[PDB]
Amino acid sequence: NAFCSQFSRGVYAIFGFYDKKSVNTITSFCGTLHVSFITPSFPTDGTHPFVIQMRPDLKGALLSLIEYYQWDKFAYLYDSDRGLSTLQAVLDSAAEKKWQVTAINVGNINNDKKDETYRSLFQDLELKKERRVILDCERDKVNDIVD
Amino acid sequence: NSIQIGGLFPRGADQEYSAFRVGMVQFSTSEFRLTPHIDNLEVANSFAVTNAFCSQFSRGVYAIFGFYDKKSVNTITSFCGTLHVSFITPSFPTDGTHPFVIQMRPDLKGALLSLIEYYQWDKFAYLYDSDRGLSTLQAVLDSAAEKKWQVTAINVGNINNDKKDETYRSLFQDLELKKERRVILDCERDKVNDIVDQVITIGKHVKGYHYIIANLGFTDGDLLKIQFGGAEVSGFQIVDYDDSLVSKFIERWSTLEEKEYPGAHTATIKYTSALTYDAVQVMTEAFRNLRKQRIEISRRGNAGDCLANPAVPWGQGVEIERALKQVQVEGLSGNIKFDQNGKRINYTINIMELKTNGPRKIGYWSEVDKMVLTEDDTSGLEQKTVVVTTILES
Amino acid sequence: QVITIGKHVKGYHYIIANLGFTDGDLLKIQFGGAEVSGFQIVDYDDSLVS
Ligand SMILES: *[C@@H]1O[C@H](CO)[C@@H](O)[C@H](O)[C@H]1NC(C)=O
């Protein structure tokens, strides 16, 4: 609605944000109606025309950092909010570079009792004595984990 | 009594639509008739799906049956939730609790994890396809932390098909560094045959390898090829051809003219198509339980534009949901029941193994009983030991 | 048949006893692993044949 509303008002370009759920709506409409969409949100997983992305791809910088510290076995706590684009990145590279990645979706954790979950989270991260963790989350979900 | 409904069929869903037609005939009554308005659009395209939905909504439908992709799924779940429109689909279950959505496909995530423990797997390769969402991928990865597994997940989806050979060779090259002999194929009926064919070519289908087809259509694909190879192949079957109910369906299905009913002249049926047929039955029993319940919901083709702002949900939709979700009949996919959300419950998924004589059910999986093996044990195995007699003499 | 039973993998060695080695389809038992030898009378490397 917000898109069609701004479109009926006759705009020349649209600046906004999208989620892992609404991203497809934007990329699709903007491509059909030839409307330009500028967004700071996470980059689209593919080549969607009429979309300007302010956020650079971190996927590359991350993989490079892992090799720098020479990591072979690490835990990868991810959040499905910005798409599993980076998750697939480390998993696919784990095949080539031969890594033992322990991916764990720290996203679907219900926040009104999220404690017996973290205790059971680092309980699995102790079976293999994981000492190297990668936090792929938002500025908020990170502080929760850090705490 | 004319009940207008919407039908969103992706271009290529021949057998699915054929099964949709047969259902209209088998479940047609004098009390009321269903009027399907078919719209063949590219299910992947989110924009097109939006139009097809608003179009069927302006035409004033009471319910919508169709399909969605990993991309357009959010559009459907969202609109149907806002406009209180019911959406029945055989497609993959939604990752969450989205109201006004009826899902014909049971969750395989549970049956898969149970099978892995049965074979006692600790290190296996997991070739997945991002088409049906990474819902099952997250399942095995999260369980890999608890059950302590060494999973080698590889996205076999983004493989460009106009040169997809130097990719498979480089795929099983990584699956040889750790000498992976146990692979789980989480793909569609098509992407599976492609892999199976490649497997036979490179000769990784001989004794020593173990494949698991992570879909509800184990017998839906061609197995005659990797049947005599030697490698053990397991999978899941939702359409039990041993049920007199299903057996009777095939008796009439296999005879139907393939001209009028595309891809319908076979002894088997894709689980997606079987769910479509069962979908019609659910919609019938639902609209029937509303007539016998003395509930008026009827309207006209003037619901208005779906983009109407503010968008006002027609109260008659709330009852249509409580109807479909309350339905409980017997179909091709076993006992059909639903919860308050729309996810199927109290269902049964047969665990299958591929032997020399062909596929064979070794047990089933219940949401409440986990895995339960049925008779089949080739008892015994030369157990006939040797009786050694001896005397007690130091 | 050889490919079906899987006797075309590394360890097996076949010899096609005819003058037409490239006359038949070899793309099938080419990536199997088993070594395959034969005989060719029509040299496609000759400028005459080429
Ligand atoms: C659950 O499913 C079984 C098998 O179809 C059925 O017999 C039973 O009635 C169901 N249970 C209830 C309480 O509905």
Side-chain angles (χ1 to χ4, degrees), chain B residues 46-55 57-58 60-69 72-104 106-108 110-122 124-145 149-162 165 167-168 170-172 174-175:
Chain B
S46 297
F47 171 85
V49 173
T50 309
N51 282 29
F53 175 86
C54 301
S55 178
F57 180 70
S58 295
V61 296
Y62 302 88
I64 305 179
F65 168 88
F67 303 80
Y68 51 68
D69 194 19
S72 60
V73 54
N74 289 315
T75 302
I76 295 298
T77 63
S78 188
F79 276 79
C80 294
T82 297
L83 304 182
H84 282 51
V85 178
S86 300
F87 188 87
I88 301 83
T89 180
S91 293
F92 63 90
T94 63
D95 299 352
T97 64
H98 303 92
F100 290 96
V101 177
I102 306 303
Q103 303 161 181
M104 298 289 87
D107 195 11
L108 182 60
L112 206 181
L113 297 183
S114 297
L115 190 63
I116 294 185
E117 289 191 351
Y118 169 71
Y119 294 114
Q120 299 174 353
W121 284 19
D122 54 353
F124 55 87
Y126 184 79
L127 310 185
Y128 62 93
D129 201 358
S130 55
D131 287 5
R132 301 166 313 286
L134 300 314
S135 181
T136 54
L137 174 57
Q138 296 182 2
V140 302
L141 288 185
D142 297 352
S143 296
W149 296 330
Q150 290 184 358
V151 182
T152 306
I154 300 177
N155 189 4
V156 70
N158 293 18
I159 302 188
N160 56 346
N161 281 358
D162 300 87
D165 214 30
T167 58
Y168 279 97
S170 182
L171 173 57
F172 292 89
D174 297 350
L175 300 177

Side-chain angles (χ1 to χ4, degrees), chain A residues 90-95 99-112 115 117-118 120-122 124-127 130-137 140 142:
Chain A
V90 302
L91 288 185
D92 297 353
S93 296
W99 296 330
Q100 291 184 358
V101 182
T102 306
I104 300 177
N105 189 4
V106 70
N108 292 18
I109 302 188
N110 56 346
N111 281 358
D112 300 87
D115 214 30
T117 58
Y118 278 97
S120 182
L121 173 57
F122 292 89
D124 297 350
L125 300 177
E126 195 60 23
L127 294 174
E130 291 290 347
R131 292 291 179 266
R132 298 172 177 177
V133 183
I134 301 183
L135 296 186
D136 186 26
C137 312
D140 295 1
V142 166

Side-chain angles (χ1 to χ4, degrees), chain B residues 5-10 12-24:
Chain B
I5 62 180
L8 282 62
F9 288 76
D14 298 352
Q15 189 184 33
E16 286 79 3
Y17 185 73
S18 296
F20 181 79
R21 294 175 54 182
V22 177
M24 297 296 306

Side-chain angles (χ1 to χ4, degrees), chain B residues 328 330 335 346:
Chain B
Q328 185 175 350
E330 200 73 9
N335 185 22
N346 197 5

Side-chain angles (χ1 to χ4, degrees), chain B residues 27-30 32 34-39:
Chain B
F27 303 105
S28 64
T29 184
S30 303
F32 57 90
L34 282 57
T35 305
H37 191 265
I38 311 305
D39 289 334

Side-chain angles (χ1 to χ4, degrees), chain B residues 242-247 249-250 253-258 261-269 271-286 289-290 295 297-298 301-305:
Chain B
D242 283 351
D243 279 348
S244 55
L245 195 165
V246 179
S247 181
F249 175 87
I250 275 59
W253 175 269
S254 63
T255 62
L256 293 177
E257 185 179 10
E258 191 175 7
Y261 299 89
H265 199 93
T266 57
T268 62
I269 177 180
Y271 74 96
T272 57
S273 299
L275 289 178
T276 299
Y277 172 89
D278 289 337
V280 177
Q281 179 177 3
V282 175
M283 304 178 65
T284 296
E285 182 71 7
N289 289 348
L290 264 30
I295 301 180
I297 62 179
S298 298
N302 283 332
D305 197 1

Side-chain angles (χ1 to χ4, degrees), chain B residues 200-203 205-206 225 228-229, chain C residues 3-6 8-9 31-32:
Chain B
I200 307 175
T201 300
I202 57 185
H205 67 107
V206 299
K225 37 192 177 183
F228 307 96
Chain C
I3 307 175
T4 300
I5 57 185
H8 67 107
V9 298
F31 307 96

